[PDB]
Amino acid sequence: LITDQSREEFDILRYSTLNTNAYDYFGKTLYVYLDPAFTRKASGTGVAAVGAYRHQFLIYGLEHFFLRDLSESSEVAIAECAAHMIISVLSLHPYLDELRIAVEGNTNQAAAVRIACLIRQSVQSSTLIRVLFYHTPDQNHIEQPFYLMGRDKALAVEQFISRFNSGYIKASQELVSYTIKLSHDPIEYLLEQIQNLHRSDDLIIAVIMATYLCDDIHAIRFRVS
């Protein structure tokens, strides 16, 4: 259960990240979590781009979208959508010099590795940046660029609820979203998913997980793909 004050302050108090006199105030690494679409009913693809300000977090980008055809063409669509958001966030924040991405590979491990590669090729065509992916060892023990969700989801949700209520999770006032803002405010949209958090959710799961993978404890899992 999320406090009404935290919801109110999340809406009215946002980080002004474009003052050139304040570029050296923020963390220089962008953490991205991607939750791909999974179908009786179909879920969408959730993407969140978070960063650090001291011991707090700020959301830079959010993407939530549903596909019309889910046969390999969707992999290109998911990757391009995520890459477009990342490129725009990096264009506005020149202080970001590292990119740490986690692609959820629970639904399909092979498709997750394909998406990771597609994002890496798009981002590297557009900008010169260090790109690291979360690596998990597969059935054959070879490290692959995907994240596997399990029991730790309970820990990540718990951690989030405590940080959110303390006001340690804030939005950027130059928050990038190409998929949302379609008769919405991206924050008001995210807040609706926050109010339904229990003990569609793809966007809040991406926010919870991106802020969870910020920890030093996970740093060793991020490698060049």
Ligand X SMILES: CN(Cc1ccc(F)cc1)C(=O)CC(=O)C(=O)O
Half-sphere exposure for 198 (CA within 13 Å, toward CB): 3
- Residue number, 26 or 33, with CB nearest to ligand X: 33
- Residue number, 90 or 104, with CB nearest to Mn ion: 104
**Cα angle, residue 167 at apex, residues 222 and 28 outer, rounded to 5°:** 35
Alpha-carbon span 90 to 218, nearest angstrom: 23
- Residue number, 43 or 127, with CB nearest to ligand X: 43
Contact 41, 212 (CB under 8 A): no
Q: Which of residues 128-167 bind ligand X (CB under 6 A)?
A: 149-150, 153
Which positions from 59 to 98 touch Mn ion by CB under 5 A, shown as an x/- string?
A: ----------------------------------------
Distances (CA, A) of 189 to 26, 128, 180, 195: 25, 32, 8, 10
Q: Out of 35, 72, 97, 216, which one is annotated catalytic? A: 35
Give me the residue label for tokens 């991206």: 186
Which positions from 190 to 209 touch ligand X by CB under 6 A, shown as an x/- string?
A: -----------xx-------
Catalytic residues: 35, 104, 202
Question: Footprint of Mn ion on this chain (CB under 5 A)?
Answer: 11, 35, 43, 104, 202
